[PDB]
Amino acid sequence: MNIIEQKFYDSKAFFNTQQTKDISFRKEQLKKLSKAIKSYESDILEALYTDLGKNKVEAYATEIGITLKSIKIARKELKNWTKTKNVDTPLYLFPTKSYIKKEPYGTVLIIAPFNYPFQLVFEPLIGAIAAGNTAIIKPSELTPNVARVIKRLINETFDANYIEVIEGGIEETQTLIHLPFDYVFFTGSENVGKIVYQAASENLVPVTLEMGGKSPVIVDETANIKVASERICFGKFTNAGQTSVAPDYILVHESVKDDLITALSKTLREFYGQNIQQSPDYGRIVNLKHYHRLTSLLNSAQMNIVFGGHSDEDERYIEPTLLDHVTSDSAIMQEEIFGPILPILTYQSLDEAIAFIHQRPKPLSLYLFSEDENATQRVINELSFGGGAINDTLMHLANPKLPFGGVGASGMGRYHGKYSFDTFTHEKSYIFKSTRLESGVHLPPYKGKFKYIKAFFK
Amino acid sequence: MNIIEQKFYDSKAFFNTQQTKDISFRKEQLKKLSKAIKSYESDILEALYTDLGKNKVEAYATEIGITLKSIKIARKELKNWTKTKNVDTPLYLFPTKSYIKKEPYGTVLIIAPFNYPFQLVFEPLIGAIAAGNTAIIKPSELTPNVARVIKRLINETFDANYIEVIEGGIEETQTLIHLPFDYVFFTGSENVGKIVYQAASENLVPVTLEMGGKSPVIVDETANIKVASERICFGKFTNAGQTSVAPDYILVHESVKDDLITALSKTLREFYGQNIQQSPDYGRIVNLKHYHRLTSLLNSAQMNIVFGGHSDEDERYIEPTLLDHVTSDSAIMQEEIFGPILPILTYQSLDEAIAFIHQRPKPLSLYLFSEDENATQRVINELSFGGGAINDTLMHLANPKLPFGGVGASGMGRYHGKYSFDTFTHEKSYIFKSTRLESGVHLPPYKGKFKYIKAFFK
Numbered sequence: 001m002n003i004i005e006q007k008f009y010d011s012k013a014f015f016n017t018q019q020t021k022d023i024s025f026r027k028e029q030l031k032k033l034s035k036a037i038k039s040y041e042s043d044i045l046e047a048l049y050t051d052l053g054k055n056k057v058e059a060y061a062t063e064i065g066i067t068l069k070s071i072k073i074a075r076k077e078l079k080n081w082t083k084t085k086n087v088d089t090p091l092y093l094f095p096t097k098s099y100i101k102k103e104p105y106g107t108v109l110i111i112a113p114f115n116y117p118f119q120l121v122f123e124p125l126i127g128a129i130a131a132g133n134t135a136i137i138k139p140s141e142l143t144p145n146v147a148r149v150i151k152r153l154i155n156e157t158f159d160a161n162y163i164e165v166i167e168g169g170i171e172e173t174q175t176l177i178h179l180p181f182d183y184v185f186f187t188g189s190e191n192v193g194k195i196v197y198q199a200a201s202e203n204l205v206p207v208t209l210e211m212g213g214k215s216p217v218i219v220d221e222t223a224n225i226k227v228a229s230e231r232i233c234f235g236k237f238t239n240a241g242q243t244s245v246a247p248d249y250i251l252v253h254e255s256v257k258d259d260l261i262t263a264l265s266k267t268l269r270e271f272y273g274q275n276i277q278q279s280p281d282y283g284r285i286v287n288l289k290h291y292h293r294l295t296s297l298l299n300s301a302q303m304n305i306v307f308g309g310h311s312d313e314d315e316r317y318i319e320p321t322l323l324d325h326v327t328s329d330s331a332i333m334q335e336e337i338f339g340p341i342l343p344i345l346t347y348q349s350l351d352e353a354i355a356f357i358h359q360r361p362k363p364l365s366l367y368l369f370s371e372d373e374n375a376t377q378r379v380i381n382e383l384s385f386g387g388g389a390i391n392d393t394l395m396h397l398a399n400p401k402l403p404f405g406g407v408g409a410s411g412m413g414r415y416h417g418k419y420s421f422d423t424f425t426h427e428k429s430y431i432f433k434s435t436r437l438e439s440g441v442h443l444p445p446y447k448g449k450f451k452y453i454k455a456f457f458k
Numbered sequence: 459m460n461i462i463e464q465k466f467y468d469s470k471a472f473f474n475t476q477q478t479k480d481i482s483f484r485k486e487q488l489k490k491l492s493k494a495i496k497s498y499e500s501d502i503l504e505a506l507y508t509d510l511g512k513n514k515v516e517a518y519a520t521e522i523g524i525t526l527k528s529i530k531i532a533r534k535e536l537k538n539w540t541k542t543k544n545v546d547t548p549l550y551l552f553p554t555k556s557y558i559k560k561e562p563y564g565t566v567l568i569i570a571p572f573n574y575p576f577q578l579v580f581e582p583l584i585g586a587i588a589a590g591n592t593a594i595i596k597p598s599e600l601t602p603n604v605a606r607v608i609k610r611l612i613n614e615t616f617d618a619n620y621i622e623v624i625e626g627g628i629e630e631t632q633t634l635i636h637l638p639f640d641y642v643f644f645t646g647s648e649n650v651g652k653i654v655y656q657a658a659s660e661n662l663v664p665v666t667l668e669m670g671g672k673s674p675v676i677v678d679e680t681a682n683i684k685v686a687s688e689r690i691c692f693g694k695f696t697n698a699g700q701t702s703v704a705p706d707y708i709l710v711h712e713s714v715k716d717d718l719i720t721a722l723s724k725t726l727r728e729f730y731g732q733n734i735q736q737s738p739d740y741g742r743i744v745n746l747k748h749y750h751r752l753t754s755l756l757n758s759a760q761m762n763i764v765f766g767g768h769s770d771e772d773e774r775y776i777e778p779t780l781l782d783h784v785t786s787d788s789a790i791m792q793e794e795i796f797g798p799i800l801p802i803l804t805y806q807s808l809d810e811a812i813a814f815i816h817q818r819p820k821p822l823s824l825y826l827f828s829e830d831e832n833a834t835q836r837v838i839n840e841l842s843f844g845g846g847a848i849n850d851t852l853m854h855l856a857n858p859k860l861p862f863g864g865v866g867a868s869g870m871g872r873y874h875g876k877y878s879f880d881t882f883t884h885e886k887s888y889i890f891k892s893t894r895l896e897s898g899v900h901l902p903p904y905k906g907k908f909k910y911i912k913a914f915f916k
Contacts, residue, residue: 016816018840057904057911065915087859096850098857103842105865182866194662201656204648204669206870209662224893231891234901271902281902358474371893380888382476384561387887392554395889399556401545402887407563408640412664414885427872429845429860430838431853433689435682435829443692444729444739446515453515457523 004175007164011107011134014161020132021104023082027075029129029158034071036157037064037122040149044118047145051117053284053315058238063118070123070400073417074130081130081421089431092441092456097432102425104132105206106182111173111196113188114142114286115242115338120187121150125163127420133183135163138176142286174199181205183424187244190409208413208423210406212336213363214248217393218353218379219260220370221253228369228391229263233271235367235393237320240283241339245365245386247393248337249326250344251353257346261322264342265307268320276319277312285316285339294318294339301332301343308340328356350375357383362408367393386410462633465622469565469592472619478590479562481540485533487587487616492529494615495522495580498607502576505603509575511742511773516696521576528581528858531875532588539588539879547889550899550914555890560883562590563664564640569631569654571646572600572744573700573796578645579608583621585878591641593621596634600744632657639663641882645702648867666871666881668864670794671821672706675851676811676837677718678828679711686827686849687721691729693825693851695778698741699797703823703844705851706795707784708802709811715804719780722800723765726778734777735770743774743797752776752797759790759801766798786814808833815841820866825851844868 019025037044044064048054054063074081087098108128112120121139128135137154139147144167151165166172173192177184177199184207186196193211200207219228236247252260272279285291295311301323302309308321318340326332326343333343347353357366366385370376376390386406389396397404397416405414415423441452477483495502502522506512512521532539545556566586570578579597586593595612597605602625609623624630631650635642635657642665644654651669658665677686694705710718730737743749753769759781760767766779776798784790784801791801805811815824824843828834834848844864847854855862855874863872873881899910 021839055904057908060908061900061911061914065912069915087857089857089859093853093856096853096857098854098860100860101838106842190662194659197662198656198659201652201659204652204655204667204867204870211662227893227896230896230898230901273903279903281904380559381479384564384884385886389888390890391893392889392891395551395554395891396556396887398551399545399547399554399887399889401547402556402558402889403885404887407884407886409662412662426842426865427861428843428865429854429857429862430847431850431857431860432848433850433853435685435849438685438688440688442519443688445731445737446513446739450515450518453519454523456519457527 004166004172005179007160007166008107008136008179010161011136011164015104015106015134020134020162023078026082026130026132027078029162030071030075030078030126032157033122033126033129034068036153037068040153043149043153044146047143047149048118051143051146052115052239052286054239055280055283057281058283062116062239066119066398067122067126070126070417070420073400074126074421077418078130081418082132095434095437099430099432101428101430102131103428105424105426106133108133108135108183108424109138109176109181109185110135111138111176111184111186111188112140114140115239117143117146118150124185124415124420124423127415128424129163130421131424133424134161136176136181137163137165138173139165139167141167141169178202183207185423186210208405208411208415210244210411210413211364211409212244212338213361213406213410214333214336215245215363215365215367216357217247217250217367217369219250219252219256220350220368220372220375221255222371222375223256223369224371224391225256225259225263226267229260229267230270231392232367232369233264233268233320236342237268237271237282237340238394240285240318241337241341242286243394245394245397247342247367249333250342251347251356252344254346254348257344261306261324261344264322268307272320277317285318288313288316290339291316291318294337294341297332297337297339297341301326301330350378354379354382362386362406362410364406364410365396384408462624462630463637465618465624466565466594466637468619469594469622473562473564473592478592478620481536484540484588484590485536487620488529488533488536488584490615491580491584491587492526494611495526498611501607501611502604505601505607506576509601509604510573510697510744512697513738513741515739516741520574520697524577524856525580525584528584528875528878531858532584532879535876536588539876540590553892553895557888557890559886559888560589561886563882563884564591566591566593566641566882567596567634567639567643568593569596569634569642569644569646570598572598573697575601575604576608582643582873582878582881585873586882587621588879589882591882592619594634594639595621595623596631597623597625599625599627636660641665643881644668666863666869666873668702668869668871669822669867670702670796671819671864671868672791672794673703673821673823673825674815675705675708675825675827677708677710677714678808678826678830678833679713680829680833681714681827682829682849683714683717683721684725687718687725688728689850690825690827691722691726691778694800695726695729695740695798696852698743698776699795699799700744701852703852703855705800705825707791708800709805709814710802712804712806715802719764719782719802722780726765730778735775743776746771746774748797749774749776752795752799755790755795755797755799759784759788808836812837812840820844820864820868822864822868823854842866
């Protein structure tokens, strides 16, 4: 009765035909998706480069390669993920049989951001397809050519009543989130996350939200500064900072603080050489507006740049900038940076570092560079965060056996690997008690049965 | 800065002391809880009988015995549930180690209804305790003596900053749900469910909602009417109908429809004899208001009572009533009955039965009495519901290896057994990449590394 509603009702109607629930069907659409991505493979990278200055290597590894292997893993495991699970039954309920069926939710909404525009559409989508749902996809219009390449790939591969792509901004998102989807999957900002979560509450819709925060990295008195410098910079300088799990700021112990900076800068040259603006290993800011935002942050923290700093408006360039003498109350530590600026703060005792992170909202990721075991055991035991890495950054996302998701302000729910499948699955317990052997052990009248009932639970 | 807020902040502060995260601590509070329930064992049944007319046998089996064994299972499995899980890592990320830590959310809210007032406080609470949280409990004030017995048991056993009981109605619930709890667990009505879900969205709080609906039971042309009569009546007539998973109405095939009724009535006498009002095996309605509600339903469906019907206001008695010639549009089929009235409807083709259930919201449970395998395979394959039973009712809740929870309008999330523990757990992925063997296989510059990166995912 309206354009977006028209497509929503058609997707729901196709699901109710129930072709989606058949495993043969799902295995085949996974195949078509793998083939379609490979067919558009250079049609994914032209758009990633024009929208995000994303070079072919990292673009492939973060958006195309990761999903192609995810499709493969899902096709290999589809029969295990979907198979009904038999469940041990208690002896006092004998002969009852116990099962858990893995059934889809129905029609599913996927909202994806701008920074990994392809990855965050298709990793959940693989889950939804594998789980037997229909899907309506909302990709970011901040990366417009990526968005249309996704629409072209989806329209060419699938019928709209099975998977469809709605392009647009907040207006279209508002129409979608107020529709009665059977599941909503969202990656993006805490603020839009709140908009989605409140909109889903009205129709009692379950959701997975993956938002952000400020990911700490504790560089400890016992650290291996050399490797940490490289490891941290990979995490921070891939996609030019725009990564919900990128290190947002460093909590570096007093003693090692100056070492790090040289190590950083030196191993930053090992990454993009002198004059990074000419490197074909380093990305760009998504947009003029995000640009004028991160430049203003550099212009306000200009007293404290210690390595990097300049920027060209015409190609949305900002170089790997490192800050120093930063404090809890400065403007750079008020918001999530989501850019190539790395503020560095000093700490004396580990208790203060932990306390500093505790006072703040729970981050999506947390990183500790330390060789001390008692130190790691307490950073891990007392700080709650989404996920993270001891002596590494980012690369915990690369293992699809580890769920990826936030906690508290950083998010709820999780995906990657099987978890993508589980996010879009309802686990339906059912039992089966044959009628040949009937009894009466728990039925009425109770008269003198009390003893036997107490014995059921003792 | 206000009474309920005062207790909330104290619970949060105690959690931040971090005694709760220690497994030795959790095992001991589980022990104290088991001992405390056994100490109040007759103090649980006096209140269940005065509030719900619940006789000692069923009261024990549905509220006390089920939780005591749940405490035992949690104490036996606590080390397995809590232990950090090691995760196979991919070869191309070698030597990285991969783990999932099971950590608590923090401070937790549990809201419990009137109909199983003790069970639905303590089965989730066991989860919360086992997961390492603090807890604030909101029990129904419709069963007031049960509520206070719970407060007395909790206050005597634990300090309020660890687990506390707030008594009251919707006002106190409103104050609680708008506080920034780390998790909200709710059992109750769809309408109050919506109130809770929307209140949780404002603070980005994850929730488990367990609401209701109208649980179907398909009695099929191939059924074993005799045993089904008993099995259905156990499910329906325990707790005098007031059970979110009780059969709310029967879809009985045309041919067998009259058989059932006699079978029902006859095996209803096998349960509570002639004159049920004198049976000490049959419960009562929680309240005058719920009473005047279910009596009005009988007074409006008075043309169609075929077995049962009368009611005493002074002991809130309503007898096992069976209806006949009921239709989709009658007033009894508009709302969830939650009482001892069983409307019975006829169907011709199985497709109509499935369609009738499909058109309605997804029920918390679904029951099919049939000996035909193709029939069961499609009832199970095409109808989405919370959980349920083939050739039985209710008893799928009794197996703590099967998750218990709704889907769609009936609920989101699940508990019982380990699932109770998981509901209150954050699974935190972390990796550990040693610095002794450093490399450079995925770091920049990319120059001629493309081939190797493609190989990572192929």
